[PDB]
């Protein structure tokens, strides 16, 4: 499952978490089995404007 978020919300991508992303955007199950990988993409996803 691939997507993009902001750094402060990376914590929300985990079982049993709450917040904007977890509640309304992407919710993992409490018994989630698998891995979560996140890396900064400021050079790629940022624009001067």
């Amino acid at each position: 499952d691939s997507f993009v978020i902001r750094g402060d919300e990376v914590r929300q991508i985990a079982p049993g978490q709450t917040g904007k992303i977890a509640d309304y955007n992407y919710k993992l199950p409490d018994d989630f089995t698998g891995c979560v990988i996140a890396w900064n993409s400021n050079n790629l996803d940022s624009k001067v404007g």
Binding site: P15, G16, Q17, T18, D30
Partner: protein
């Protein structure tokens, strides 16, 4: 007191039951002896523990 023996038996049993009931007030290392407070306060991953 002549029938002490019989009475004693009763007492012993009662004490057991009483003790059992009081054990419901112990946290046993948890954060609260009240199940509902644990459910409502912590996230499911740690409320499970």
């Amino acid at each position: 007191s002549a029938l002490g023996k019989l009475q004693d038996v009763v007492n012993q049993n009662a004490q057991a039951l009483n003790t059992l009931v009081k054990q419901l007030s112990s946290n046993f290392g948890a954060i609260s002896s009240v199940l509902n407070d644990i459910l409502s306060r912590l996230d499911p991953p740690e409320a499970e523990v």
